[PDB]
Symmetry: C3
Subunit: 333 residues, 3 copies
């Protein structure tokens, strides 16, 4: 009887940060309550000032990371305010039935709904909007995020020993298809509704115009670079709701990687680069051993450095010359 279970309310945070949670469950199963408000909004996605009409869960691209444990119930209150113009819903890849919840969560502007589902499978999973007839348009306008369902006894390595992270970040990667005119300039629009047939044409090229982390070119750089210290254990959850990606930590590795994100499987060890298929979330665990700047990229390097799929870590601490050193610094001959 679900009414006898504890309820706990989560207050979400903006990506790439993740709300507070316990890796090993400190209670029995709970109903974990979340609220998200859909926001259609203009977003500037690149250095040139290209502006799109984004569709968001909770104001961000990606939507926030939700965290529960296996066999918890997730109860989501989904709000579509009357300041929006479109019908929306939500499909959780973590859930079982009704198109992942999509069939039960159709909300017009001015409506809300509450969905409950049991988190029966541990892993990181995509969630996304999926309104009948409009699915890729909503997804590729930014309306996707992820949910992490931890095993009740936390993460384990390939031998069944505990893995405990000190820090966690969520990197949502988004493919955008901004319509272009024959000369190649982006076509701008006043409303989200304006784009439709041109949005379909741009998508059908299968060639994104931008591929970004956390909603914009350079979002995870500068003052917004990810941080860690030498010796810290970091889990990076990465999702892509529509298109394959291949993450790589330049200067590091994925020490333990669940490329397709499901924790009942042993992790792959010592990865340089890993493939996360479109429609999937994956997770990589790394212990930093060197200080300095690292680039975290999609290792199609065109997609990274021309189209936007690159972020930075800034790592503090002690340099280890046994691991790497310049024997003879660049100089003339």
């Amino acid at each position: 009887d679900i009414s006898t279970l504890p309820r706990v309310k989560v207050d979400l945070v903006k990506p790439p940060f993740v709300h507070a949670h316990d890796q090993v469950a400190k209670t029995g199963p709970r109903v974990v309550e979340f609220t998200m408000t859909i926001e259609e909004k203009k977003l500037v996605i690149d250095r040139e000032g290209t502006e799109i009409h984004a569709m968001t869960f909770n104001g961000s691209v990606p939507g926030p990371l939700m965290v529960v444990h296996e066999n918890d119930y997730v109860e989501l209150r989904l709000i579509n305010p009357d300041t929006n113009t479109l019908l929306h819903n939500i499909d959780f890849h973590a859930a079982t039935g009704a198109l992942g919840g999509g069939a039960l969560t159709q909300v017009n502007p001015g409506e809300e709904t509450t969905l409950r589902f049991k988190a029966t499978k541990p892993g990181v999973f995509v969630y996304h909007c999926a309104p009948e007839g409009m699915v890729p348009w909503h997804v590729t306008s930014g309306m996707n995020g992820a949910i992490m369902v931890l095993p009740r006894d936390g993460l384990k390595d390939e031998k069944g020993q505990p893995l405990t992270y000190d820090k966690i970040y969520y990197v949502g990667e988004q493919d955008f298809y901004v319509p272009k005119d024959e000369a190649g300039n982006y076509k701008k629009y006043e409303t989200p509704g304006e784009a439709y047939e041109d949005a379909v044409k741009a998508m059908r090229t299968l060639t994104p115009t931008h591929i970004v982390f956390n909603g914009a070119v350079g979002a995870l750089t500068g003052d917004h670079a990810l941080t860690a210290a030498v010796g810290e254990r970091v889990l990076v959850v990465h999702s892509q709701a529509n298109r394959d990606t291949r993450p790589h930590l330049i200067g590091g590795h994925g020490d333990y990687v669940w490329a397709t994100g499901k924790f009942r499987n042993p992790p792959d060890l010592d990865q340089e680069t890993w493939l996360i298929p479109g429609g999937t979330a994956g997770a990589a665990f790394y212990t930093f051993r060197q200080p300095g700047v690292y680039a975290y990229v999609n290792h199609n390097l065109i997609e990274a450095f021309e189209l936007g799929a690159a972020g930075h870590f800034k790592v503090t601490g002690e340099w280890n010359d046994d691991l790497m050193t310049s024997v003879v610094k660049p100089a003339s001959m």
Copy 2:
């Protein structure tokens, strides 16, 4: 001595159905006899009435699923009737030597041939036509299918315990490259031979115009939706002879998945989405837990919902509110 072995003749069925077979072998090794007749034919592949000159094994796209057991011999009589115009052959990825059989099976119109090979490796495998100099044109005109080589003791999970399916379906996914004129309309042709240089140009874009299950947009919907009941164990074999795909059962999971299709490896558990590389067959096992409509898609959602790579399951049975429920149905605030 092969002449001392039992011979058994299989009568193939049209995809997505699969001919009768036993999961656990009830006899010793056999010579399993198959016959396929090549058919070049016009096919209408979309709702708009786009017509291509398809090249088929046995009249269908994909070709039918063949099923044997490890260490059986497959004996295929391949018939190219004189009503066809092109030379064809067959490459089995399950086979060892002679380009998978391609070098030994070149048949002009009005010829036939019989190939035998030993099925030494268990798994699902692609087969396709591959005539020298014309390989991608034949493959992307529909001339591919798959073969399943079951272990003699059937399928096993990651712990070595039996997995038994109640139903099996074969989903062949096909990328088509219909030539277009400068304005973007499809160029139509009277003969298969007509297309050649324009077919090459269209392929070189690396951008399919259509991506379909079972030969056409909407083929696995309506009266032709896949079916199951709550509690049934279903194996879905999925192939793509030329291009990567990422299957996903919307509202379900792959409980056990062999993404690259080879049964001596343990399955991956609890997949949301899995990558089947081009030139590979994969297999996913799921036990249905909820009734209703499910969408089975390539989770590049553009490829699914714009280009055609989507089918449906219709599932009968009892709804489980513990797994999912609408707490508050969509309503105004």
Copy 3:
């Protein structure tokens, strides 16, 4: 103290061949010394005579395969002669810190540098140039290769038993983006520097014009086909620094495959085709069982047979009719 370790100097060879090494380490940890000279040079990449300005490590596309053992130190002297025009550096995916060495190895024409790093993780790994602001242009001009870090006790199968190869080859796969004019002809250039904005435009299409093994269409055919004998155990290392590939041995299999190339993981067995993500090296082990010609391809067959990603093995020895035979040779009805 590194100064107390043996030093051993390696003399590299041109791909697809690999310098001499021992699978099981016959010494303790060593400093393994390598020298590479950067060469910007014109290369003809196809049958039509298309000429690009390539950027190479040691004169070849790919750069040579380096081979060490786990916990060796790699010491690379990297030379940028004053006959080149561009700044270059090197990022080793095998290394830890400083962008894989990229931050410590920036050499202008007329400079050299010496980098040392400890090879802490066993596997095959990509290395590539990566100068700030110019990364995909250098990589897709050919400036990448791979390094193999063998476990000190050699390779093992999925049960922990030894796997010993008799022959090893290195197949580097390169995506090129040759700029085209509006009519579709390649734009030619006098200097590497000439291309820049047009190179960026061509890359942003995400559609390579050529995809080649060992630097050119047909490079691994004819007198330069790979060779083996029936019964020989062959390891094929395959890298792709920028874009996904899906290798397949037509007429064979990958008996043991590390698709993402990291030897602490068990291999996948009996693969038909495997996905190596862009930015990764992988390795496949096969024992040949049949003589004749095999085609080794990227199994996007358009990429293989139209764009150039195909090579051949020529295999000597005895045909096994139990594995495959023509029962009835192609003939009329």
